[PDB]
Design a protein around this nucleic acid. Structure first.
Ligand code: HYG
Ligand code: MG
Ligand code: MG
Ligand code: MG
Ligand code: MG
Ligand code: MG
Ligand code: MG
Ligand code: MG
Ligand code: MG
Ligand code: MG
Ligand code: MG
Ligand code: MG
Ligand code: MG
Lengths: 73, 101, 88, 119
RNA sequence: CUUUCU
RNA sequence: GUGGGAGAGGGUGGUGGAAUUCCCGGAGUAGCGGUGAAAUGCGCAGAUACCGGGAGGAACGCCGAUGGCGAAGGCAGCCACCUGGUCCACCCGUGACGCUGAGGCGCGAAAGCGUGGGGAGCAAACCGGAUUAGAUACCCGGGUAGUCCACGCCCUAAACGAUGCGCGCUAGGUCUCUGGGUCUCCUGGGGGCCGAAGCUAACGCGUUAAGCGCGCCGCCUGGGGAGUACGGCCGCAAGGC
């Protein structure tokens, strides 16, 4: 289904241009440093597109992950 | 001129003197290139998502400047010279594009 | 780039009368401005062919406006050329 | 002959064979097994059955160093990966956790013709 | 695996 | 002109992590690899699998699309500088200044050429294994040019939407990207699908025309011989026109 409730929903208004709110950004990555698909991130073409650049900036700053190990399996 | 944001992360193992020193050269370096500080934030230490120069934490700095654009790239050549400065990142400032607001 | 000052500073400098934003003298003026900066940028970045097209475009648009000028008022023309510093 | 107990179990599964390497709490391998380790010589090597006999052997051999608590780290999808995991889960060793850590490039080198025709 | 000709 | 907007459009520099290869160190043994089976190959000078360190080259996962940008070729990690195109709103300025375009000049994927540099992975040729009746192949193991960079040359292509450019006119419906608005929809630009009229040999096209008209360019005139001969021009050559 993928309808585990959008990520934009469970979250208040936030600046998407801010590449340091590791608290909020952390939210758009899966059980790995992977940027969630629109149909999960709940974002929009423009939004989503900006988010993605915001998330990449972070990573470089070391604030956000590039990739995580998968627990279970 | 133009408005930028300079992110600087350095060795989390700096004693009051060493640390307060790097900022000396930074503050200096900024000036030497036309950087006019509009304000600063110092979050300090933060658990990096992954190790940087073997070190699993980092000391963050944040300066918002206004300086001759034609020298932003040089300003940061300088900033990276330091051995404790392990990550420098300048950014054009931008309106805080909201969302879900 | 060209600041709003840089620009308007030229517009007034050529405008046929207060408010003349797009006469032929003006247009030829602003174009000569861009064409110079651009041809300046290409003095270097010779490999930047894409930007070069834009040059050819402006260069066209320009002589095409001058052509019209030198046709309507041969005087305003010689005036504009000697001034802007075109031909050579 | 060291006595470890708590440790890591690395399962390197591939469609060509499975190899298990049990190690200490910080990397250095203790004992390793594989398809070849046990009889199986060629094609048979890959099989999930071997993936078992290998896991077990790895553990048995590891039981000698006095193993017990182990953390499984799977690497690569292949003929009998889940099988190795189950084998360990049995054996004796207590499987504390399991984690996919298979490596994936962020698009680095051009794969052999063998694995191209992607994009 | 391949696996021609009529 | 003023005010905004989106964008992998282009150029120079810088920089981030994933992975591969190599080298060093540890721990650790008897195999690893590879296939349909195998073998060559690598491994006790200790390989594979595991951990830590280093070097180097090249590409840039998720986001990513059914998306976007460019005139085309084509363009995607991040950052900054330089820079092209383009769209919307206000309707403010000039006052037909317009369109097309033989020749010209420029651009032009890949392979290829010249000088120099670089070389991790991949890999024409080539050296081997296997398969086969044979195997100058498919499969497996190696591997040189090359792929990378600079400067210069080459100028071709299923260089494709196989659909020249500009303008006007002719139902709608739906999805989408981007701008404006009185923002459960209206309006402008762009990308898709279904479809009125109409068009078409059919397939199909259908406000993104392949419909109705006007302007200008290129081109076709049965198949083979043949993109060959010859001549001329260009090219270092291969070769191109
Ligand atoms: C006319 N000149 C030649 C042209 C050849 N290309 C052809 O293979 C020859 O012979 C026959 O040609 C036919 C059309 O090309 C065909 O397809 C026959 O199949 C053939 O049958 C077998 C023979 N036992 C009989 O010729 C062999 O497998 C081959 O020669 C094989 O091509 O003969 C073939 C023929 O004579
Ligand atoms: Mg622009
Ligand atoms: Mg008016
Ligand atoms: Mg008038
Ligand atoms: Mg070319
Ligand atoms: Mg090439
Ligand atoms: Mg060469
Ligand atoms: Mg080969
Ligand atoms: Mg090879
Ligand atoms: Mg439309
Ligand atoms: Mg009909
Ligand atoms: Mg249709
Ligand atoms: Mg000649």
């Amino acid at each position: 289904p993928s309808r585990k409730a959008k990520v934009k929903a469970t979250l208040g208004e936030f600046d998407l241009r801010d590449y340091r709110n590791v608290e909020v950004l952390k939210r758009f990555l899966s059980e790995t440093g992977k940027i969630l698909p629109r149909r999960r991130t709940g974002l929009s073409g423009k939004e989503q597109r900006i988010l993605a650049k915001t998330i990449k900036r972070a990573r470089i700053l070391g604030l956000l992950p590039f990739t995580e190990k998968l627990v279970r399996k | 001129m133009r408005r930028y944001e300079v992110n600087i992360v350095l060795n989390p193992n700096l004693d009051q003197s060493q640390l307060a020193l790097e900022k000396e050269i930074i503050q200096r370096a900024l000036e030497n290139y036309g950087a006019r500080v509009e304000k600063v934030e110092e979050l300090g230490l933060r658990r990096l998502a992954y190790p940087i120069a073997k070190d699993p934490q980092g000391y963050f700095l944040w300066y918002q400047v206004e300086m001759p654009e034609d020298r932003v790239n040089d300003l940061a050549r300088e900033l990276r010279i330091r051995d404790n400065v392990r990550r420098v990142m300048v950014v054009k400032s931008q309106e805080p594009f909201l969302a879900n607001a | 780039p060209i600041t709003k000052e840089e620009k308007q500073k030229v517009i007034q400098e050529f405008a046929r009368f207060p408010g003349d934003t797009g006469s032929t003298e003006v247009q030829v003026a602003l174009l000569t401005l861009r064409i110079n900066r651009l041809s300046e940028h290409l003095k270097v970045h010779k490999k930047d062919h894409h930007s070069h097209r834009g040059l050819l475009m402006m260069v066209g648009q320009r002589r095409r406006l001058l052509r019209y000028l030198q046709r309507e008022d041969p005087e305003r023309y010689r005036a504009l050329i000697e001034k802007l510093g075109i031909r050579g | 002959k060291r006595q470890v107990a708590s440790g890591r179990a690395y399962i390197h599964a591939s469609y060509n064979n499975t190899i298990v390497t049990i190690t200490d709490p910080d990397g250095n391998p203790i004992t390793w097994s594989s398809g070849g380790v046990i009889g199986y010589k060629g094609s048979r090597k890959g099989t999930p059955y071997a993936a078992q006999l290998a896991a077990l052997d790895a553990a048995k051999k590891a039981m000698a160093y006095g193993m017990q608590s182990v953390d499984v780290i799977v690497r690569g999808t292949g003929a009998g990966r889940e099988q190795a995991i189950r084998a360990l889960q049995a054996s004796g060793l207590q499987v504390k956790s399991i984690v996919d850590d298979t490596p994936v490039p962020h698009n680095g080198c051009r794969p052999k013709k063998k694995f191209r025709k992607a994009s």
